[PDB]
Design a protein around this nucleic acid. Structure first.
Ligand SMILES: [Mg+2]
Ligand SMILES: [Mg+2]
Ligand SMILES: [Mg+2]
Ligand SMILES: [Mg+2]
Ligand SMILES: [Mg+2]
Ligand SMILES: [Mg+2]
Ligand SMILES: [Mg+2]
Ligand SMILES: [Mg+2]
Ligand SMILES: [Mg+2]
Lengths: 49, 144, 287, 110, 95
RNA sequence: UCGGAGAAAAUCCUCCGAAUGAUUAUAACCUAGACUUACAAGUCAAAGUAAAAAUAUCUUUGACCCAGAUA
RNA sequence: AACGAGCUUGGUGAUAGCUGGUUACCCAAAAAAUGAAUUUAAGUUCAAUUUUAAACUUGCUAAAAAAACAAAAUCAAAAA
C-alpha cells in the first residue's frame, strides 16, 4: 500500500508484483501505486522537454 | 532570561512590575467625558465605503447631564429620529473603525459645544445675510 | 482517465517519437533566399545599413531630450532609504487561518518568513515588516506580534481582539540573521548583539503610542486606553487571559532570538549550545 | 505547506473554506492548489485582453465548459468565449469572472 | 549605451537619466520643466506656475528612458512615508 | 534667431522693428477644461482659497551642465 | 627602382555618415521622396505614414440648412 495519503477523489493504481527467482514467478503479489505518480496526465511534450 | 544594560527594568527602574504595561487604568471611565459604549447601539451598513451609524435616545440617556441634553436636542433637532433617538452616521472611509471613530467624535464635540456657551456670533456670512434680509422683507410685507 | 487508455492502444513512447508542444518553437530566418537575402533587411546603403548609426538617445546633433531636462533630486539618497515590507491584517488572517502562522506562540519576523507570509530582502534595503491597516474590519485573532512599524488602525485591531503588538528595531546585520537564522548558525560564529536604533528612529521606538520596544512600560496603559475610546471598543484586561505569559513575552533590546543570549554559539551538528566563560567577553555581550 | 487547521465554524474569517465532504458527483473535478485555494486566476495579455483561467481540472473538461457557459450566459447576455486546453487541463474564458467562478465552484464543493 | 559590459557582461544605466527623471511603478516617468529656475524676473506669473509643476513623459520618451535604465530602477520600493505612494498604481484605467 | 505688414496658403519676393523700455492702484497661492506642439519650449482659464475693497497699462529671445548671491 | 618625409613588425580585424558586395522556394501586405531639429542638407532622431498582434465600436462616401468668411474646401442633424 502507498505510504503517503492518496487524494480521496482518485482511486489507487495497481500492478502485479513479480519475482525473478523462477521463470514462472510472474505474480506473487499485488501492489498499490500512488495515482499522482503512475496515473498523471499523458504529457508527451513535457517528456520531450 | 538574558538581560542587558538596556533592559526595560534598568532603563525604567520604577516600572519594574511585570504587569505595569498590561494593567487597565484605574477609573478613567468617568473623567475625560467617557462615552458609555454599551448604551450606544452600533449598526454597520456597507453602503465603496462601509457606513457606520450610532443611535441613542437623547432624552432618556442619563450619562449626558440634563442641561446638556436640552441644548443638544434644540441645536441638533435635525439629527433626532421620530423615535427620539439621535442618529449620526459616517461614510468617509472604507474601514468601519474610522467611520465609528468619526461618529463617536461627533458625540464628544456635540456635548462639548453645548457645555461651553458660544458667546461669539462671528462675522455674518452671505448665507446669513440673505436669510436676514429676506426675513426683514417678510416683516415689512406684514405691516397689516 | 480515458487519455491513459489511449496510450495503451498507441505505439511505445521512445526517443524516436518525441515532439515539442505545438507552436513552442519559432523559425529562425537566415539571409539566404531572395525574401530575406539581398539587402538582408537593412535597407539601402547608409550609416544604418553599414551598422554604424549613433548611440541610443542621440537625436542627430540637437541637444537630446534626456539632457535638456533639469537635474532634480528625485532619486537622491535612494539607496540609503529604509524599506519596510507591508503586511496587511488581511494577509495575516489568511496565514493564521491556513495554519502557516501559529497564533499560540509569539510572532516575529522569523515566523512570518518561515511560513512564507512575507519575503524579506535585506540586501535590497529592507528593514523589516510594517503592519498595514488593510483587513482590520475582518481581523478576529488574538495574537502577539512584533513588527518594525505599525499604524494606529492596525494597532487598534490587534489590541481590540486581545492581542499585543510592539514595534522593534533590527539593524541590517541583525535583520539578515533574524530572517535566515540557520545559515548563520552554520558559520560557527557567536550570536551578535543587536544595535540600538539610529538617532533618527530613537523617538519612534521610545514612544508608547507606537508601542516602541524602548518606550516606557508605565505609559502603555494610558496609550492603550486612548485607542479604545477613540475607536469605540472596550479595552480587554489581558492579565486575566490564560495565555498572558505568552502575550507579555518581549525580547531584550539587545537580543535577536527569544531564548538565545548574545555571544552564544549554536552547535547544530551535536545539538548543543556553547556559552563563553571569559569575563571580558561576558561584559561585552551583556552590554 | 501545513495542512489547514480544523475550524469550528466555516467560512473562516479570511473567507477560506475547505472542500466539502461528501465529494461532488459531477463529471469533472477541480483540484485545489498546493496552498489549498481554488485554482482560478485572472490573466491579461497584450495589455488589453482580460481573461480568467480555471486550471486544475480533472475528468471531463468539456462538461465544465458546458456548465460555465450556462452559468455565465445570463450575466453576459451572450455565450462566453472560452478555450479548452485538454492537454494542460485548463479552461480559459474571455473576460474577468474570477470572483463569480470562485463562488460558483465553492457551491459545487470543490 | 553599454549593452554588454567588459567586467560583468551586463547592460549599464545612463546615470544622466537617473539624475533627472522619476519612474512610477505603473510605467510612467516624471520630470521637471526646462528653464523653471532660469530668468524668473522676466517670466509671467502663469508661466512660472507652469514651470514649477512635475510633468509626465510621452510613450516614446518613456520607451527611451526604459531602454536607458536597468531593471533595478523599475522595481517596487516600499518606502515608509513615501510621498508618491498613491501614484505607483493606475485606477479605473480602461484601454 | 524671432516679431509686424503685402503678395494671398511658394519666393534669392517687398518693407518696419526686437534683442525693448516706459507706466504704475504691485498684479498671491491653488486648480476643471482647452489651444499650440515631432521633442523641447510657448499660450488662455472657470471654480476654490488668500490679500485687498480695478486689472498691471502699454504689445519679444537662449536649454542642460557648470559657476555665483543670500538666508 | 614613385619621400611634403624611409622601411619592417606591432598597436590593428585602426577608422571610413564613402564605393563595392551580401548565397533556396512559396504566400501575403507595402510606404514616399511629407513637417521639424541638427558643423545639418551623401547622415541621423522625432512626427507622419506603413505594418503585426490584441481590445471594442462605429467608420468611409455623402452630408441639408448655418453659421465662420467676403456679402471649395473647413465644420457634419437625419438618411442612404
Ligand atoms: Mg540570425
Ligand atoms: Mg521584495
Ligand atoms: Mg510639449
Ligand atoms: Mg475666480
Ligand atoms: Mg623607395
Ligand atoms: Mg570598416
Ligand atoms: Mg554624410
Ligand atoms: Mg551647433
Ligand atoms: Mg451621419
Amino acid at each position: 500500500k502507498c505510504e503517503l495519503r492518496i487524494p480521496v477523489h482518485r482511486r489507487p493504481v495497481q500492478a502485479w508484483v513479480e519475482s525473478l527467482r523462477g521463470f514462472e514467478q510472474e505474480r506473487i503479489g499485488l501492489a498499490e501505486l500512488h495515482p499522482d505518480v503512475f496515473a498523471t496526465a499523458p504529457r508527451l511534450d513535457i517528456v520531450h522537454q | 532570561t538574558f538581560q542587558s544594560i538596556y533592559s526595560l527594568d534598568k532603563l525604567y527602574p520604577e516600572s519594574k512590575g511585570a504587569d505595569t504595561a498590561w494593567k487597565v487604568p484605574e477609573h478613567a471611565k468617568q473623567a475625560s467625558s467617557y462615552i458609555p459604549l454599551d448604551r450606544l447601539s452600533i449598526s454597520y451598513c456597507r453602503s465603496v465605503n462601509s457606513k457606520a451609524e450610532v443611535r441613542f435616545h437623547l432624552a432618556s440617556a442619563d450619562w449626558i447631564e440634563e442641561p446638556v441634553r436640552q441644548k443638544i436636542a434644540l441645536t441638533h433637532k435635525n439629527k433626532i429620529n421620530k423615535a427620539g433617538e439621535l442618529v449620526l452616521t459616517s461614510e468617509s472611509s472604507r474601514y468601519q473603525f474610522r467611520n465609528l471613530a468619526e461618529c463617536l467624535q461627533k458625540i464628544r464635540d456635540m456635548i462639548a459645544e453645548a457645555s461651553q456657551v458660544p458667546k461669539e456670533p462671528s462675522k455674518e456670512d452671505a448665507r446669513l445675510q440673505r436669510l436676514r434680509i429676506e426675513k426683514m422683507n417678510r416683516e415689512r410685507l406684514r405691516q397689516k | 482517465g480515458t487519455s491513459l487508455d489511449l496510450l495503451r492502444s498507441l505505439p511505445r513512447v521512445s526517443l524516436a517519437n518525441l515532439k515539442p508542444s505545438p507552436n513552442s518553437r519559432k523559425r529562425e530566418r537566415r539571409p539566404r533566399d531572395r525574401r530575406r537575402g539581398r539587402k538582408c533587411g537593412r535597407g539601402h546603403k547608409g550609416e544604418r545599413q553599414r551598422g554604424t548609426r549613433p548611440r541610443l538617445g542621440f537625436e542627430g546633433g540637437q541637444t537630446p531630450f534626456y539632457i535638456r531636462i533639469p537635474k532634480y533630486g528625485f532619486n537622491e539618497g535612494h539607496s540609503f532609504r529604509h524599506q519596510y515590507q507591508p503586511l496587511s491584517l488581511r494577509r495575516l488572517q489568511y496565514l493564521i487561518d491556513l495554519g502557516r502562522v501559529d497564533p499560540t506562540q509569539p510572532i516575529d519576523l522569523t515566523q512570518l518568513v518561515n511560513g512564507r507570509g512575507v519575503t524579506i530582502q535585506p540586501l535590497k534595503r529592507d528593514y523589516g515588516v510594517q503592519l498595514v491597516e488593510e483587513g482590520a474590519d475582518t481581523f478576529q485573532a488574538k495574537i502577539n506580534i512584533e513588527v518594525q512599524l505599525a499604524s494606529e488602525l492596525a494597532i487598534a485591531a490587534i489590541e481590540k481582539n486581545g492581542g499585543v503588538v510592539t514595534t522593534a528595531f533590527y539593524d541590517p546585520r541583525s535583520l539578515e540573521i533574524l530572517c535566515k537564522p540557520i545559515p548563520f548558525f552554520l558559520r560557527g560564529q557567536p550570536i551578535p548583539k543587536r544595535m540600538l536604533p539610529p538617532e533618527s528612529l530613537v523617538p519612534y521606538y521610545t514612544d508608547a503610542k507606537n508601542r516602541g520596544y524602548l518606550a516606557d512600560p508605565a505609559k502603555f496603559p494610558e496609550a492603550r486606553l486612548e485607542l479604545a475610546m477613540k475607536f469605540g471598543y472596550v479595552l480587554p484586561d489581558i492579565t486575566k487571559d490564560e495565555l498572558f505569559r505568552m502575550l507579555s513575552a518581549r525580547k531584550d533590546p539587545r537580543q535577536i532570538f527569544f531564548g538565545l543570549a548574545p555571544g552564544w554559539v549554536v552547535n547544530m551538528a551535536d545539538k548543543k549550545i556553547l556559552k563563553p566563560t571569559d569575563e571580558n567577553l561576558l561584559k561585552y555581550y551583556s552590554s | 505547506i501545513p495542512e489547514p487547521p480544523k475550524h469550528k465554524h466555516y467560512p473562516t474569517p479570511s473567507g477560506w473554506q475547505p472542500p466539502r465532504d461528501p465529494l461532488p458527483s459531477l463529471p469533472y473535478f477541480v483540484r485545489r492548489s498546493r496552498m489549498h485555494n481554488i485554482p482560478v486566476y485572472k490573466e491579461i495579455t497584450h495589455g488589453n485582453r482580460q481573461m480568467t483561467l480555471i486550471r486544475k481540472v480533472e475528468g471531463d473538461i468539456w462538461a465544465l465548459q458546458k456548465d460555465v457557459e450556462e452559468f455565465l450566459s445570463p450575466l453576459l447576455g451572450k455565450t462566453p468565449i472560452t478555450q479548452v486546453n485538454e492537454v494542460t487541463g485548463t479552461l480559459r474564458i474571455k473576460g474577468y469572472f474570477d470572483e463569480q467562478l470562485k463562488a460558483w465552484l465553492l457551491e459545487k464543493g470543490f | 549605451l553599454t549593452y554588454c559590459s567588459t567586467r560583468k557582461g551586463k547592460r549599464k544605466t545612463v546615470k544622466s537619466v537617473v539624475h533627472r527623471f522619476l519612474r512610477l511603478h505603473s510605467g510612467l516617468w516624471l520630470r521637471r520643466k526646462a528653464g523653471y529656475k532660469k530668468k524668473l524676473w522676466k517670466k509671467s506669473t502663469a508661466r512660472k506656475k507652469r514651470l514649477r509643476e512635475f510633468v509626465f513623459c510621452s510613450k516614446t520618451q518613456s520607451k527611451l528612458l526604459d531602454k536607458m535604465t536597468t531593471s533595478f530602477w523599475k522595481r517596487r520600493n516600499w518606502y515608509a512615508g513615501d510621498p508618491y505612494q498613491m501614484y505607483h498604481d493606475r485606477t479605473n484605467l480602461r484601454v
